[PDB]
Amino acid sequence: TFKQVADDWLKQYANDVKVSSVRAREKAIQHAIERFNTKPIQTIKKHDYQRFVDDISAQYSKNYVDSIVASTNMIFKYAYDTRLIKAMPSEGIKRPKKKVSVELEHHHHHH
């Protein structure tokens, strides 16, 4: 029944956003629902959640990954708030430092 709940929620989100983003994001979100079709949303653990994020990262660009993560988190929180599921897997995930430095400015050298 997650597909129906996610499908209903996705339609409301499409209220204000790029159509291409919704179609592309829906494809990634829909793929996760079909993949976890035998695995209930309330049975999803933090480990599997990270696996999904890394799975789409190798299939989608970083910009698209952010939208999928937010949509997935918003959909998960929506079902939890409706007391339809008894779980909230997502918190406890952090990665301090260990990040690649950004050169931001392309000038680099200066005088």
Side-chain angles (χ1 to χ4, degrees), residues 53-101:
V53 174
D54 290 345
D55 181 353
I56 59 174
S57 60
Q59 290 180 85
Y60 296 88
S61 283
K62 185 177 180 61
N63 289 141
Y64 282 73
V65 168
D66 288 344
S67 303
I68 292 169
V69 171
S71 179
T72 298
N73 179 356
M74 285 292 290
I75 291 166
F76 274 46
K77 185 177 181 178
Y78 176 80
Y80 176 78
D81 177 11
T82 48
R83 291 178 180 196
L84 299 175
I85 57 173
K86 189 175 181 178
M88 191 195 277
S90 153
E91 292 177 1
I93 298 171
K94 290 180 180 179
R95 185 165 185 181
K97 297 180 180 180
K98 292 174 75 167
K99 283 175 77 171
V100 298
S101 178

Side-chain angles (χ1 to χ4, degrees), residues 7-81:
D7 177 12
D8 287 347
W9 188 91
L10 281 163
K11 295 276 182 64
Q12 293 178 48
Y13 176 77
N15 281 189
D16 286 340
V17 48
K18 290 180 176 77
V19 62
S20 60
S21 181
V22 174
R23 184 179 187 273
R25 194 185 71 182
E26 182 177 12
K27 184 178 181 181
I29 294 171
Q30 182 175 343
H31 181 5
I33 292 166
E34 189 71 6
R35 183 183 296 276
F36 299 120
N37 178 355
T38 66
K39 286 166 59 163
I41 188 169
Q42 60 185 49
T43 45
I44 294 172
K45 47 183 179 180
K46 44 171 68 163
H47 180 26
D48 180 353
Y49 176 75
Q50 284 290 287
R51 183 180 187 275
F52 175 61
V53 174
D54 290 345
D55 181 353
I56 59 174
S57 60
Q59 290 180 85
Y60 296 88
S61 283
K62 185 177 180 61
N63 289 141
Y64 282 73
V65 168
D66 288 344
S67 303
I68 292 169
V69 171
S71 179
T72 298
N73 179 356
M74 285 292 290
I75 291 166
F76 274 46
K77 185 177 181 178
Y78 176 80
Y80 176 78
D81 177 11

